[model samples]
Each structure stands twice: as structure tokens, then as C-alpha cells.
Target: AALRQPQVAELLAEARRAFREEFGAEPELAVSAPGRVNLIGEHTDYNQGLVLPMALELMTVLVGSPRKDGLVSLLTTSEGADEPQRLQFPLPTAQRSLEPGTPRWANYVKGVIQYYPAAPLPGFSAVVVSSVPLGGGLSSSASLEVATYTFLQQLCPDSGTIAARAQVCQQAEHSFAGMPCGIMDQFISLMGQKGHALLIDCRSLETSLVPLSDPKLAVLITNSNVRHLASSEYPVRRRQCEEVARALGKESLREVQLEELEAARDLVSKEGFRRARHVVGEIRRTAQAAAALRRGDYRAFGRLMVESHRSLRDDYEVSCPELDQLVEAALAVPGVYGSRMTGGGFGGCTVTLLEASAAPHAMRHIQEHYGGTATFYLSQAADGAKVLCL
Candidate 1:
């Protein structure tokens, strides 16, 4: 599937118009970064396990021109919002860190600049707009960080590699945004390919593009319409995983085998053991799912997805009622091969693999049941973050 052309055109036009009006000058550069859906892996990134994710056509775009006077100014427009929010801060040395009460949106931009290593950075004014659903476990914030990083690269022509950029973006989230996250989001945003799902090894930071362009299959994302704060409960899950790792005498849960975890189950707290079990099981599932995708075995892939959700729901205890309901409803439909809740959980979105021909039927079934409470869409793999124009 593809994004509607008219919608893309209209968004760009609005962003350009907003930038012109806000800054009284035309934008000299434009860049965009894609949000992603985890195809098989969830909640395993921090444990240094396997994950398969593909970029969504949904993206965050930044359009702006640089300022010679070393002052950064920005105007942001969220999807369906009327007015753009504006922020300004002086460059580099004079830039202050965002405190707890700072406007949430500004931190995404501020974080990028704060962690950017290039010195004496030239400032810019930008208008930001996105189609990526915020707080739906789609990595919208990562998309914004990467787009901002690309825009800044234009002004300061750095020698940074793509991996370096990914790290910088991740650091921005940790130190500036105050959210501890894994490398998968930023890495995929920078390196994602069209018509492929990326298989990422979180330990070594290695990645391979796995083909996912079967004409018979479709990727459907259903949003639970329940908002989540990444700061809430996410850290708790991470801590649980850490506790398991420490108990197992390992640096990360990735080093612990399922049998090993099961053997030592009594050594850790009940919560830690459950969390560790999910990670161990998920890592195995991710590997099996990748092999299934490689061999064009959608049936096996679908079964793995179902098992993954069960582990996350029961063992990990991350799935909320709405997410569980959507997955159950999706599996009941004829065409869906597999459905699973796809993010940090606590309520977000579910990713489903289905028969291309059965998409309408499955979507209709989901709509008939969940209707006004959920939002649904079809997405295809897309290119990663890039400079759209300069």
C-alpha cells in the first residue's frame, strides 16, 4: 500500500506555507524520517535480542533555512492541529537544558541539538509536520529526532557515519529527552529500506535487510487510540529485565537461554522471572520469524506472531485490555495470518500480517467490532530517513 498522494502534497504545502509565514523566509532544506512497526519482536531491544522492523510510510518532515546569527527557532504543526507551536533558543554555549516542566514537543528538537557533537553549529528556523501517529508505539519521536539531525547536518556538514548519527539520536533521547530507549528505533529510522524488514541484532548493532514484499501479504496496523507516556511503566519493564540479567549473572537477558532462565526461575522475583521468560522466548521467536520470512512461509510466521503476543501478554504482562481485544478480534477474521501487539505495550498499536485479498474483509471485521475506539491503516515498507531537498 502507499500513502495518498493528495494528502502528501497537502501536508508539504501546509508545512511550506507555515514556514514562510512564521519565519518570513523560504525554507532552504527539507528532510523526513519514517516511523516503524516491529514485525515480530517487541520489548526485547534493551535486552540485546533480535528484532525485525520495517519503516512505515508515515513520517515526520522538517522544512527550514539556517540562520547565520547562531539562534535556533522552530514552528511545529501536529497532524490535524490548527496552529503551529513556536520555540526559540540561542545556539550552543547559551543553550540551556530542558527541565521537567518544559513544553514536551520542544525537547525532541532541543535534544537533537544538545547531543549533536558538531561544534559552533549554525542555527535554523523550521516548520515540522508529521503523518506518524504520536504515542502509538510508532517511533514518531525518533522520526522527529532523525529529521532534525539531517537538517542540522546540512548546515554543519559533519563527517558522522549513519551509525554515529543513530547513536547521537539515541543519546538525545536518553540525556536530553530523559527517556531511556534502545537503539532499534533510531537505527531503523536511519537505515531502513523500501520493501524490506530489517533484522537487527541489538548486541552487536548488526543489521540485515530481509525481503518482505510478497504480493500475497499485507501489513495492517491498528491503533488502540490509547495514549501512552514512554516514561511511564516502560522503565519499570526495563528494570525488571535488568534484574533478571543480574540474577542470571549476565549483562543482558540476551545471554540467558530459555532453559537457563527456567532453571534459575526460583532465584529471581516472580516479576523478574516472568519478564525474563518473555525476553528469552521473544528472542527465539524473532529468530524463527526471520527464518520464516526468508523462506516465504507466511503461515509459520503468523503462528509465531500469535505466540509472541501470548508471551508478551501473559509472561511479560505488558498488554492492556484494548490491545488484547484488537489482537483477538483480528485473529478471528478470515484473512489475517497473525496479529500481535507491537510496541512497548501498555496500550498502543497491533501489527497484523494478512492475506492481501482479505485485507478489506479483515479491516471491516475489525471496524465493525472496534469501530470508533480504534484507528486502522494499511502500510508498506518504505525508505528510511533522508534529505528530501536542499
Candidate 2:
């Protein structure tokens, strides 16, 4: 369920209290970035295909006040550390390469700090809190990176455009966190609008909003409680797509048609062909899905969701048993319009589109069947990252 208005108020009050207690003064800025759930278009972003993602109400919030000293100090409620982490370096020079053996969570924050577009950023003290589940494939890391960057923007007050901010966040993951991620997660988190899913063109970097305001429908996400490292198979999958593009004499798999891939089957390895097939099919499905939503054809959108999961599971080879089971369980429910594994697969979460009133029944079915520390919740599209004043 989405956070209630009262709960949100309580959290904000708690953040303000924490900030005052930690810094001995009220915070100058409070910023937050929402986590996202992709309705379709898995594994197609890197192939330069379309993707549909909506920001969730779940978010990471940070409260901070600027410091006169050229020092950055950080504290988080999520991490159970007793002492705050501090960094002292001159202005832009404070940006440093992530050293080996640095704590993983800390790297997310440091990455943003190190890559800020402006040099000589003023020092600040911050306290962070988040409701987004970790390792759930809901882009928690992207939320943190974006929230931190949003905080920096307010502190610095003169920075680049939102597009550039998104790229910088992506680079932070690549260089500091050592993950080569696509731009969808970061882009949507920074630019999403309420009541709609953003349709992103990976190649052109253009975006359009697809309305998702149907009162009869709801989006449910079920976490399998099994964690998978996106980095493990992500690069391998990207390379396979590149090989297919090379075989077809194209820039990306996005440009290759299904007939063309079928015609050139023998030209590339079997695995490469499968990967290429999934990307091509997914690109088409994404367009259809977006159109379905625009026309209020929920059934058509539902069918595309099922097809997308099959492609991701078979052709892309990214789904795992846990993810598969969750999807299967969701599909068994009568009100579920469509259900499929979302994220980078391996093991993460499944997104289901169903009747809004059927949510409880679906959650019960998923919990009873899937059985681990599985979590089920309903979310709607939310606004993008922003600074909060309280």
C-alpha cells in the first residue's frame, strides 16, 4: 500500500527532528527521490529500445544543512552505524576515486559527491532515511543517488539541467559503484509525473507520458525475497546484443526486425540470436503496451505484459525460479489482468496489473503460494525527485 498522508507527515517530522539533533540546527534542505517499477520493457534499454516505468511513492529522503568548513559528513537511519562518516577535501578536489574495500552503501553517496558538476561544493551534514526495500530490484540505489544529487543542487544552487543530472548519476554508478546500468531507472526517477508512466526512447533520450490513471486498475509488486546481483549477468547480456547487432550490420538490436533476425539466424551464435530476438520483440511490445494504456484497453496491455515476461524468461534468459514462481502465482489469480517478472531478472520482483478491488485477494494468494519473506504492495505513479520544505 502507498504511504498514508498521516504516515508521511510523521516521517517528515521525524526527519526534521533527527536533523536538528544531529547538526544542532535545522536543515537548510530536504530532498527525496522515488524508487521505480517498470511495467514492461525489461532488458531492452541497453538495446536502445523503449521502456515504460513509473515512479513509486516509496522514496529515500535526506535532510541536511550546509557547513562553512570544506567537509562532508553523512549519517543514515538505514545503516546501523553508531558514528557518522566524514570526508574532508578541498572543493572539487574532494572528489576522489572509490578505494577498494569501501563499504558498499557508502559508495552510493560518495559517488554522487565525487561526480557533482560544480567544483568547490560547500560542505554539509545530512541524515538519510528511506522506505524503498533494498535488493528488491526497485532501483533503491538510483533513488539514493538521485536524492543525494537533488540535495547537492539545492545546496550549490547553480548546476546543470535535469538531463545532465541524470547522466551524472548514471556515471556515478558506472565509475564508483562499478555497475554499467541503463538510463531508464535514473531518468524516470528524476523526470516522472504523477498518474502516468514515462515512455523513454533509449536512443534519442526523448520521453512521453502514457496515462495510467484508470480508477479500476492497480499496479502490484511482489518481492520474492531472493536477491540477485544485476552486475553478474547484465554485462554479459549487453555484449550478446552487441554481437547480434554486429552480425546484422546494424548499430543496435533495436533496428533489426524479426524477419531480419530470422533470416540471419545462422550468421550468429544461437545464444546471440535469442538475445536479439527478445530485444526486438520487446521493443514492439512496449510500443503496443503504451498505446493500449492510451486507449484504455487494459486487456490488450495485459496480454503484452505476459508476452514480455516470456521473452525475458526464455529469449533473454534473465528470469530465475523465484521470479518465475511469483509470476505464475500472480497469473493464477482471477482478477489479475497480467503478471510478469520485472527488473533485471535473475531474482527480484514481479509486477501485476489487476482490478484495484482485487488487491487483497491477490496479495493473499501470492503470500500463501510463494512462502518466503515475500512482500506484496500496491503503488501508483508519483512525482519525480524534488527538494521538500517542512
Candidate 3:
């Protein structure tokens, strides 16, 4: 029951009622956008790198309607919650952009407004509820933006193209959340295909799909149970990477050749320079891993995962002790090929690839070894955001 604590049925019921009260009509339809897991390439996105992410079954949903006054309301499906939060923003025609907290989690709503400014449709009201664990490096923030943007599209009819909508959400998060994040999270959650993983080039925003069909394998996510300080640690990493790029005479570390890392290994002793090296190397690895995955070569892909984690741990300095222990335990267990910290790091979950039959043993082993504090679980690649009727 703990596994199902954020009951979908309960959440949906609350959404239906909220829609009735707020919009005065039943929502015509609902949509879901999933939180995502990066199979590899952690912290490489801001560096203009590559990431392989899969949309999970767990997601956020929106029940919404088109409004006439250009006001947006926010709601969540928590059982004890009584009323939704009402928020008002200027219409897009007013040239109103975010001010001070514009693109926060709330800004997801405004971001969509910015994306689809129909001089005709006034505004929107949505009861937003989510089961995606926030700050788990599971892309919960992206889930919110994608789900909200899609829901508004259903009502507005004049919503912009998919790419445009995604960019609006990305920029909204960047300006509102104050995190200079990349588009990998929003892109994968918005565009992901079921039963397949997306390989995204952060530089070009080009994506390719790779199916995870190994009957022998399953994806494991182990939350270190260490709470994250996204407000503090996230920005530091972003600034460090940007500084490195500037020092290296590159727009981003993505443009740095692998050979440059070897040639200038001496000059990269500074903190930012070292951080950039991880991004550059990881980008190369991401390309290679994607090609290997296309050829159905899991072994090579697994090796890349191990190397990627080392870079994140040593050079990027994101992994904590719990994360290190989880990775160490995963590698020690038989049938586990590769494991690495999945999100922006500091404290969150780790992604592991292992044999299907051996997953139970690996999970049990980690639970016992990590004990009461750390929890492990199995995650499937779930559908993107959608609405559900109660």
C-alpha cells in the first residue's frame, strides 16, 4: 500500500470535483505527463551534452478549462486539501512575462499562456495534481510543466506547436525556478514514446528512440532517501559548468573535443574546468552508448554507465555517501551491469540496469545493506501526461 500511497483514483476524484467548482463544467478531457529517469548522462544537459531518459508510468495530471478573463487557478489532489489556489496573470497580448516568480511551478501555467497566446481564448483554470516525487531527480518539475502545458492546449485550440510549447515550459522553469536547466527533462517527458527510451542531443534538441526490450533486464531506481537542497546545490553546478565553458573558449562543453581534454588536462585543474571535462567526456560517451544501444549491445552500454558515474562522483562532485554506497552495492551484486546517480545529484535517486531475474536480489540486497533510511524500487517507462476522469 505504501507503494501506492499517491492513489490515482483518489487524485482523479478530487480533480473532477475541482473542475466542477472552478470551471462550472466537467472537463472535456484530461492529459498526463510523466516524470522521467535519465538512464545515463547525469548533469550533462546544462553543458550542452546528451541524455537518455525514459518517461515513467508515474506522472502529473491536469483537469482544466478555457477561461474568458485570462486567469489561471492551481489545484492539487491531496486528500485533506479543501480549496484550490487562485492565481491571475496578465494576458500575453499585454506583453506580460514573468516577474520575480513567474515561471516557478506555478509558472508552468503562465509558460503555457506565453506559448499559446490566442487573442480569442481568455485564460485557463486547472486543478494540477501529481504523484511524481519532487526533488527525487525524477523530473517531477518537468512533469508539472508538460502536464500543465498539454492540458491548456486541449482547451485553447490555438496552442502552439509541440516544440514551441516545450521551450516555453523550459524557459519558464529557468526564469521562475532560477535554475539554468537544460531541456532534456521537459523534452523527454513531452515527446517520449511508450516502451522506448529517448536519446536527446541537448545541443541540437534532436532525439532518437531506443527500445529497452532485453527480457533479461529491468530498470531499478534507488532513492538514497537523502533530501535534496535544489535551491542551493543546483545553481552552483550550473554556474561552475558555465564558467568552465567560458574558460575553454567554447560556447558549451558540448563543442569541446575529447582530444582537447587530453591536450589541456593540465589547464583544467580549476574546479570549473574539471567540471567541464566531465560534461565533454559524458557527451562523447552518450553518443557512443546510444549507437551501442541501437545495435542491441547492452554490455558496452553498461560499461559507459559505470564510467559516467565515476565522472559525476569524482569530477563533478555530486554523489554523496548514500549514493556512493548504492552504486557500490549495485556493482557488487551479480547480474547488475551498470549503475549511476540519475538526477542533478546532491541527494536523489540512482538508475541501475540489471538482469530481470536478478533484480529482486539486487533490490533486497540494497535494502538490507542500506537499511531503514534508504529505499529501492522498480520503475517502468510510463506513458506521458494525460487526464483521467474520476
Candidate 4:
């Protein structure tokens, strides 16, 4: 029962009732998009590498009515908040974009509104509720952006392909949120399929759906309850990759061979060489891991998972002590395949692959040994965002 808490049905029901209570009318539809977990290939995205991520059952939900008026109003709910937070705007001919004082989360919403592929959104009044935990690199912002676009998709139904919609969402994050997140989060949130993990080529932006077929296998995420200061860390991380690229006399590390990086080892700082090493190796590992996954080679895949974490921890230097402890604790659990601290990570969750039956035991182990409070989310691949009901 704990596994089923915040059931999709419950979110839908709560959203629907909220729309009715707020608008005094029935909703046109309810739309939702899930957060995601990166299975492997950490920190490889900026290097034009590959990432395998699957959608979470946890999602952002919007229950709404379209208005003939050009005004858009939103009421966003959190767990047991005193009252829902509100944001209202218009699909005006022109209006002020986000200013210094705007609510931070509102930028994600406004970004989508401003960059909507086919605009003149008739207008919508939505009650937004999400179980996608904010921050910690679960892609809560992406989930919210995709959910907003999903609501718009239902209303227009012909704005663009899923691919195009995904791009539009990215633009919003870039322009509004001021986060140049690679399209991986938005793409999978839009295109995710149940029981499948998406194998994405970050450079090409082409994705292949890799089915996760084993019922006995599960993906577990243990939130260290420690926040990543990505705002400061990402810029520094990016420059290290850039410095390595400059030393190699290349456009980006995507095309840099391992030998080239080794030869240029002394040209860049010691830290830059280690950064390039992790990126070059991780790109290869991501491709191999995808194939292993396709063939149900869990052991091989697990090995890659471990290797990726070691590189991220030692080379990329992203893992914090809490994240390290979480990975270590899970590795000690029986039935575990491989574990790694995932995301940009100074602090955040670790993704662990383990036998489904081992979940309870793993949870207990992480709690006792992780040295801090931890939250466990045992998720399987789930469907992409879509209209849940009319």
C-alpha cells in the first residue's frame, strides 16, 4: 500500500474536484507528466553523450477549464499548504515577461506560455497538483513545464508532434527558468512509454525506447535529503568540460578520443584531464549499457552503473559524502545489481538497480546506515504525459 500512495487515481480525483470547486464547473480534461530517474550515464549530457532515463510514476497534474477570455489563471497546491498559490496572466497581445520579483516557479509556467508552439491559448484556469518532489534533480521543473504543455496539447490537439512539443518545453526552461537543461528531461517526460527506458543520444537528439521487461527487476531512488547547489556547481562543471575541449582543440568533448585527452593531459589542469576522462568513458559506457539492457544483461549493465558512479565520484567529483554513503549502503544490500549517485550531484538521490523483492530490505539498510534521513522511491518506467480524462 505504501508503494501505491498518491496513486494516479487519487491525484486525478483531487485535481478534478479542485477544478470543480474553484471554477464551479466541470473540467475539460486533466493532463499530467512524470518526473524521471536517470538509470546510468551521469554527467554525460553536456558532453554530447548518451543518457538512459525513465519516467517516474510520480507526476505533475493539471485539471483545468478553457476560457473564451484571454486570461489564464492557475492555483497550485502543495501537500497540506495553508492555501493554494495563485498565478494569473493573459495571452495578451503583449505583456511583461518575468521580472526580478516574479515567483521563481512561475517562470516555468510563463516560459511555456510564451513559447507555446501555437499560441493564443484560448485561456485556461487550472488547479495544479504534483507529487513530483521539487528540486533534487528529479526533473520537477521539467514535469511542471511538460504538464503545462500537456494541458495546452489537449486543448489544441494539433500544435505539434511530441518531438516538437518537447523542444518547445526546452526553450521555456532555457529562456524562462534560466536553466540550459539538455532536452533529455523534457523529451522523456513527453515521449516516455510504460515499462520502457529511453536511450537518448544527446548530440543527435534522437531517442530509442528500450523496454524494461523484467517484472522481477526494479529501479530504486534514495533521496539523500541533501540538496545540490547546482546553481553554483553547474557553471563550474560546464567550464571544466569547456577547458578540456579547448585544450583538445575541439568543438566539444563529444568527439574527443580517450587517447587525444591523454596526450593533452598536461596541456589542461589536472582536474580538467580527469573531467575529460569521465566524459569520454561515460559516453562509451552509455551506449554499451543500452545494448546490455536490450539483451537483459543485468550483470553487465550493473557493472557499467558502478563504473559510471566511480568516475562521477572520483573524476567528475560530483558526489557528496551523503550521496556516497547512500550508494555504499545500497551496494551492501543483497539482490542489488549496481548503485550510483545520480544527477549533477553535490547532494541528491542515488539510483540503485536491485531485485524487486529486495526493496524492503534495501530500504531498511539505507535508513540505518545512510547517516542522515533518506526518502525512498521505488519506481518502474511509466507512460509519458497525456490527457488522463475528458
Q: Quick one: best TM-score, which candidate?
A: 1
lDDT of 4 by residue, 1-390 (tens): 124538678898889887899888888878899988899877777778899999989899998988887678888786422232777765645565544125667778887877777754688889888887677567887899999988887767654677788888888877887776776888889879999999999888889999997889988888887874656767677789888888778887888987677788778898888988999888889899999999898888988999999999899888889988998898999899999987667887889998999888999988999789888888888988988876
What TM-score fits each model?
0.94, 0.93, 0.87, 0.93
Assess the local accuracy of residue 253 in candidate 4 as a C-alpha lDDT between 0 and 100: 85
**CA deviation > 4 Å runs, candidate 4:** 1-5, 79-84, 92-101
Candidate 4 clashes: the total is 0
Prediction-by-prediction clash tally: 0, 2, 9, 0
* Per-model CA lDDT versus the true structure: 0.84, 0.82, 0.74, 0.83
- Taking the tens digit of each residue's C-alpha lDDT, what string does model 3 give over 94-202? 5665454522445555655565544355566677777667778888778887877677657655446666767877887776656677888988887878788988988
lDDT of 1 by residue, 8-44 (tens): 4565677789888988877888888889899977889
Better of 1 and 2 by TM-score: 1
RMSD of 3: 3.4
Question: Would you give me the overall lDDT of model 1?
Answer: 0.84
**Candidates sorted by lDDT, best first:** 1, 4, 2, 3
TM-score between candidate 2 and the true structure: 0.93
